[PDB]
Amino acid sequence: MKYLPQQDPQVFAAIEQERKRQHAKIELIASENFVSRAVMEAQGSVLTNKYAQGYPGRRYYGGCEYVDIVEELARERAKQLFGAEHANVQPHSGAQANMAVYFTVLEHGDTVLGMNLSHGGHLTHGSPVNFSGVQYNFVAYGVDPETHVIDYDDVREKARLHRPKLIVAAASAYPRIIDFAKFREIADEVGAYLMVDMAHIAGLVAAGLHPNPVPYAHFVTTTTHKTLRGPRGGMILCQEQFAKQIDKAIFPGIQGGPLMHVIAAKAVAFGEALQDDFKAYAKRVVDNAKRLASALQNEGFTLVSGGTDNHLLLVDLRPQQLTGKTAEKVLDEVGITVNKNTIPYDPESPFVTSGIRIGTAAVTTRGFGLEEMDEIAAIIGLVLKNVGSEQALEEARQRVAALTD
Amino acid sequence: MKYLPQQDPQVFAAIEQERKRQHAKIELIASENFVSRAVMEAQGSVLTNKYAQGYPGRRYYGGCEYVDIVEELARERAKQLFGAEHANVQPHSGAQANMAVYFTVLEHGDTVLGMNLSHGGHLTHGSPVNFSGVQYNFVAYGVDPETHVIDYDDVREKARLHRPKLIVAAASAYPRIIDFAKFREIADEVGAYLMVDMAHIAGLVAAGLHPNPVPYAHFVTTTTHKTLRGPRGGMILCQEQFAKQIDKAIFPGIQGGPLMHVIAAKAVAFGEALQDDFKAYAKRVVDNAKRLASALQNEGFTLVSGGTDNHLLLVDLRPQQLTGKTAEKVLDEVGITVNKNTIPYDPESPFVTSGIRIGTAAVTTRGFGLEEMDEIAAIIGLVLKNVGSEQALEEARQRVAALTD
């Protein structure tokens, strides 16, 4: 940076602290990643100056010829990536992408069936303190109490009982592959739309490492950050038959001016995801997660579902008589960033929890491989088995520093 | 830029086109501005990498110590700027800032009273194709047919008839000062909350050039772009008694993760607005708008309300037998960017209109003064009085180029 250090010392010092923090810590938050310098440059561009309400070639302001090229680049690259008939790259966030789909097909008070929030469903999939649970009548399907895999018979029974207008599949804390074909079969039986929120797994889908929901779902929503490794924002994919209605939901329905600089950053991230090396990256993400799961099991930890098919894993800490909250706090002390996370059938509140959620996308981006996975598992074992030993925590601190340099 | 040109030639070329466009054109879109290099640097920072759901010191992810400093800088600088008891700097946009206020105090189907959209009210103030008009029962107050000033007796009568839970004041195309004391007096008479959407006038309020709605309104919403000259985003100000509820509406109510890099950019823009030279800038904005209004009247144009108290003016093109659509198109041909805009009691549809909206914030930022105002008015006169003369349009084109260099 050149101008910020002089203009705003206070903001610059805090940003610099954050930059140094990102390098020093082992980032295991499953939704986090590190974007390229190209992505950041696009977000730091003059495109923030441009009002471009509407859509490419159908804008409500003149002078949009060049931001149109940008938005179309993002939409066409998204369509290449996922095989979608239509893309909307304007959602400000995952929240707004979901909001717009609901706005498209639901009336106030309609019934929606989503994944149980305590079993891995997202806040925007019916939390009673979120617009989703306030605006619509959400019902939940669950995972098997033993396997922690989505119980597809439960999805079906809930769908047949409650007759939802819309079924939502996908999750913020589900470590196994989701069967979209089965979700669509159930949707079809009850005459519901199917929405897939692939936010967490979108980069894996792009790399052919998770089945693609696009052929099975009426609407696919996603964040552009997470495994897709793009800027913070949302996106909607859908078949051509819903394109006009989806675009109208985003604008003039729920948003106004899009963030054209962020959309530029989306296009860049999509360009990166189209490359062969992104495919290799995403495979390393999944390989690393499997290795980390296996290594944690070697340390004596129990994992929700017994492992992972994707980028993320959930440690069930009940055997260690630890809460997620305690584990999160002590790992923070040694420079490992995780989050407490409810496990299926958690006896604890969501503010305490019996689990921690871990993902490999961010460490993989930094170049961590299988050997680093073994060491991270070993450090987690050292810490969680010795929560009262400051000597053990200091050894952990040094081993973390050795990994990040 | 260093990395984008190599990584993504297609995106870079389009951004470069847009950068050159911004320099070459005379930008008179009333909602547009040019942010500083410091603001853009903050938006192009590593802060995009950080999930920070929740609030400073009350986050749902570890490692937020430094983004907390950033968010608090933004909130405290906002409170200094506007004298507000509480600020929420997380809204993704003006749309979301408004959405969250509605979510805070309204139930589905509640009555809201806002400014007539055709008289200057915004889309999010009750458009039947926007979430506002779909979710709530919007009624409208109007401006006087002669003066084009808000008819405060009409605000009162509509409020007493319809008994709204909430009254909205402020506009996207109102060229006069709004009387917030009178809005609050009417709100009080009927037991309604008062929301002021100061998006357009926020920089003028910050500079003491427009009366401050904060002392009169329960909630004040704004965009951070426009006259405030910040990054694209939203903000909510309110008294301490609504702080907890407003924060809960933004999250977990209507959003998820905030854009921490944009919030950094907000802090920077607020730092700039606190400086003496921003006050001088904002006065030049208003001076330039008054000069431009006067110069346009000298050219024979009729202005809605007979002039302006702020950054913006509306040309009533009926005397010239031109639509806003025709005027917008022909001005585009010579490199002047305006938008068609409905005028009060417009006989034309909002897709055609009888007006153009013009603001001085962007040209003022580029250093345009009173002499430049006279010349812009002279060029507009030359073009609009000679719509069928390619020779006149070419002379206009050359005079525009002379202004931008």
Best CA proximity match to B127, nearest among A252, A230, A143, A376: A252
Helix (H) or strand (E) holding B348: none
Binding residues of B for (6S)-5,6,7,8-tetrahydrofolate: 117, 121-123, 240, 349-351
Between CA B194 and CA B220 the distance in angstroms is 9
- Scanning A239-268 for CB atoms below 8 A from B yields 248, 252-257, 259, 261, 264, 267-268
Instruction: Judge: A70–B264 Cβ closer than 8 Å, yes or no.
Output: no
From chain B, pick out residues whose CB is under 8 angstroms from the CB of A277.
none
Say which amino acid occupies B97. Answer: A
* DSSP-assigned beta bridge partners for residue A166: A112, A193
Nearest by CB to B37, which of A3, A33, A135?
Answer: A3
List the structure tokens of A37: 């310098």
CA distance B234 to B96: 7
Check B14 against A70: CB less than 8 A apart. yes
Annotated binding site of A for (6S)-5,6,7,8-tetrahydrofolate: 117, 121-123, 240, 349-351
Number of residues written out for chain B: 405
Per-residue buried b or exposed e for A303-326, using 16+ beta carbons within 10 Å of the residue's own CB:
bbbebbbbbbbbbbbeebebbbbb
Report the relative pairing of strands B58-59 and B54-55 from DSSP bridges: antiparallel
Q: CB-based contact (8 Å) between A85 and chain B?
A: no
| Alpha carbon distance A101, B315 (integer Å) | 39
Which residue from B minimizes the CA distance to A13?
Answer: B66
Coil, helix or strand at residue B87 = strand
Report the gap between the CA of B8 and the closest CA in chain A (Å): 7
Neighbours of A161 (CB within 10 A): 11
Contact B224, B95 (CB under 8 A): no
The interface residues of chain B toward chain A in range 24-53, judged by CB-CB distance below 8 A, are 25, 27, 29, 31-51
A158 touches chain B (CB under 8 A): no
Which chain A residues are Cβ-neighbours of B43 within 8 angstroms?
A: 43-44, 48, 261
* Widest distance between CA atoms in chain A: 65
Task: Determine, for residues B15 and A51 on separate chains, whether the beta-carbon distance falls below 8 Å.
Answer: no
Which residues have C-beta within 8 Å of that of residue B391, sequence separation ≥ 6?
none
CA angle B328, B316, B180 (to 5 degrees): 110
| C-alpha to C-alpha distances, B233 to B81, B170, B228, B346, B355, nearest whole angstrom | 17, 18, 11, 31, 28
How far apart, in whole angstroms, are the C-alpha atoms of residue A213 and residue B351? 38
Residue with tokens 């999930």: B51
Stretch (H or E) spanning B314: strand B312-316
Backbone angles phi, psi at B242, to 5 degrees: -105, 0
> β-pairing, B54-55 with A54-55?
unpaired
Kindly state whether B127 is in contact with chain A, defined as any CB-CB distance less than 8 angstroms: yes
* C-alpha span between B143 and B122 (Å, rounded): 14
Mutate to test the interface with A, among B1, B17, B19, B46 (most CBs of A within 10 A): B46
A121 min Cα distance to partner chain B (Å): 14
Q: Which residues, listed in sequence order, are joined to residue B115 by a DSSP beta bridge?
A: B141
User: End-to-end distance of chain A based on CA atoms, in angstroms?
Assistant: 24
Contact B4 A42 (CB under 8 A): yes
Q: Which of residues 160-219 of A touch B (CB under 8 A)?
A: none
> What is the rounded CA–CA span in Å between residue B81 and residue B76?
9
| Rounded distance between C-alpha atoms, residue A313 and residue A303, angstroms | 7
CA distance B36 to B44: 13
DSSP per-residue codes, A367-398: T--HHHHHHHHHHHHHHHT-TT-HHHHHHHHH
Residues of chain A found within 8 Å of residue B121, distances taken between Cβ atoms = none
Compare all CA atoms of chain B with the CA of A229 and give the residue at the minimum distance.
B49
Give the C-alpha separation, A259 to A53, whole Å: 10
- Identify whether A258 is preceded by a cis peptide bond (ω within 30 of 0): no
> How far off is chain B from A153, nearest CA to CA, in Å?
31
Return the residue of B nearest to A61 by Cα: B339
The alpha carbon torsion through A71, A196, B263, B226 (nearest 10 deg) reads 40
CB contact under 8 A, A332 and B63: yes
Instruction: Give the C-alpha separation, A143 to A98, whole Å.
Output: 22
Name the residue among B399, B52, B103 with its Cα closest to residue B248. B103
Rounded to whole angstroms, the Cα distance separating A272 from A296 reads 32
What is the full DSSP assignment across A306-368? GS-SSSEEEEE-GGGT--HHHHHHHHHHHTEE-EE---TT-SS-TTT-SEEEEE-HHHHHTT-
Q: Are strands B193-197 and B166-169 parallel, antiparallel or unpaired?
A: parallel
Are the Cβ atoms of B129 and A46 closer than 8 angstroms? no
Residue B211's alpha-carbon distances to A100, A196, B46, B178, B207, in angstroms, are 36, 48, 38, 8, 10
Structure tokens at A376: 């991270």
**Three-state secondary structure readout of A102-126:** HHHHCCCCCEEEEECHHHCCCHHHC
* Exposed / middle / buried, residue A185 (Cβ in 10 Å: 0-12, 13-18, 19+): middle
Q: Which two tokens stand for residue A361?
A: 């996308």
- Residue A76 has phi, psi (to 5 degrees) of -70, -40
On the question of a cis peptide bond just before residue A215, with omega within 30 degrees of 0, the verdict is: no
* DSSP string for A76-109: HHHHHHH--SEEE---SSHHHHHHHHHHHH--TT
- In order of their start, the domains of chain A are 1-32+284-405 (3.90.1150.10), 33-283 (3.40.640.10)
> Who among A47, A124, A256 is closest to B18 (CB)?
A47
CB burial class (10 A; 0-12, 13-18, 19+) of residue A37? middle
B316-319's contacts with Cβ under 8 Å and 24+ in sequence apart are B316/B343, B316/B354, B316/B355, B317/B354, B317/B355, B317/B356, B317/B384, B318/B343, B318/B347, B318/B354
- DSSP letter, residue B251: I
Q: How far is CA A64 from CA A91, B17, B215, B229, B393, in A?
A: 18, 11, 39, 20, 21
Q: For residue A42, which residues of chain B lie inside 8 Å, CB to CB?
A: 4, 8, 11, 15
What DSSP letter does each residue of A247-295 carry, written as one string? HHIIIIII-SS--HHHHHHHHHHHHHHTSHHHHHHHHHHHHHHHHHHHH
Q: Give the separation between CA A59 and CA B384, rounded to whole angstroms.
A: 23
Q: What whole-number distance in Å separates Cα of residue B199 and Cα of residue B222?
A: 4
Residue B32, exposed/middle/buried by CB under 10 A (0-12, 13-18, 19+)?
A: buried
C-alpha R_g of chain A: 21
**Which pair of tokens denotes residue B273?**
């607005």
> Integer distance in angstroms from the first to the last C-alpha of chain B?
24
Side chain identity, residue B116: N
Strands A234-238 and A336-337, bridge-based pairing: unpaired
The DSSP line for A116-154 is -GGGT--GGGT-TTSHHHHHSEEEEE-B-TTT-SB-HHH
Beta carbons of B313 and B29 less than 8 angstroms apart: no
Residue B46: closest C-alpha in chain A = A19
Is A67–B38 a contact, with Cβ atoms under 8 angstroms apart? no
SS3 assignment, position B358: strand
Option in A69, A253, A272 nearest B14 (CB): A69
CA distances from A118 to A61, A121, A123, B158 (A): 45, 7, 10, 47
Residues 6+ apart with CB under 8 A from A141: A113, A114, A115, A116, A150, A151, A154, A155, A158, A159
CA-closest candidate to residue B172, choices B209, B223, B208: B223
In chain A, residues 322-351 whose CB comes closer than 8 Å to chain B: 328, 332, 337-339
Question: Are B252 and A123 within 8 A, CB to CB?
Answer: yes
B276 touches chain A (CB under 8 A): no
Integer Cα distance of B96 and B79 in angstroms: 20
Instruction: Report the chain B residue with the minimal C-alpha distance to residue A269.
Output: B8
Closest chain A residue to B30 measured between Cα atoms?
Answer: A51
3-state secondary structure of B318: helix
Nearest CB among B37, B60, B232 relative to A259 is that of B232
The answer to whether residue A130 neighbours chain B at the CB level (below 8 Å) is yes
Q: What is the resolution of this structure in A?
A: 1.9
Give the other-Cβ count within 10 Å of B106's Cβ: 19
CB B311 within 8 A of CB B285: yes
Backbone angles phi, psi at B233, to 5 degrees: 175, -175
The secondary element (H helix, E strand) that includes residue B129 is none
Could you tell me the strand order of the sheet in which B137-141 lies? B86-88, B234-238, B219-223, B193-197, B166-169, B111-115, B137-141
DSSP structure string for B361-384 = HHHHHTT--HHHHHHHHHHHHHHH
C-alpha gyration radius of chain B: 21
What B385-389 contacts at long range (C-beta under 8 Å, 24+ apart), as own/partner pairs, is B385/B300, B385/B320, B387/B322, B387/B326, B387/B330
Specify the DSSP element, H or E, that contains A173: none
